[PDB]
Ligand binder design. Structure first.
Ligand code: ZN
Length: 97
């Protein structure tokens, strides 16, 4: 749905980062704006926040990571760039509400 708000700082950054570097694959990643601090990343819904409008982090199931870092993880074409991560340790079982 359309809300009608000027260029949001968080959204502005998220949009850029997601489109920079631009996904090489023939299929652009899944990124849709739902609500202030909410975006559809891939096949899951996370809460992307901005620290002092300087740092971009996301809400995961056990802490917060760098948006650009969470994307590179899934995005294969991104993994190319020098990256260093472990993974995700969480007990299977989705949520609804
Ligand atoms: Zn890609």
């Amino acid at each position: 749905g359309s809300s009608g708000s000027s260029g949001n700082l968080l959204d502005d950054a998220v949009k850029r980062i997601s489109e920079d570097p631009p996904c090489k694959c023939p299929t652009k990643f899944c990124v849709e704006r739902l609500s202030q601090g909410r975006y559809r990343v891939g096949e899951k819904i996370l809460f992307i926040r901005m620290l002092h409008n300087k740092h971009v982090m996301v809400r995961v199931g056990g802490g917060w990571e760098t948006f650009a870092g969470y994307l590179l993880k899934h995005d294969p074409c991104r993994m190319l760039q020098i990256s260093r991560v472990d993974g995700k340790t969480s007990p299977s079982g989705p949520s609804s509400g």
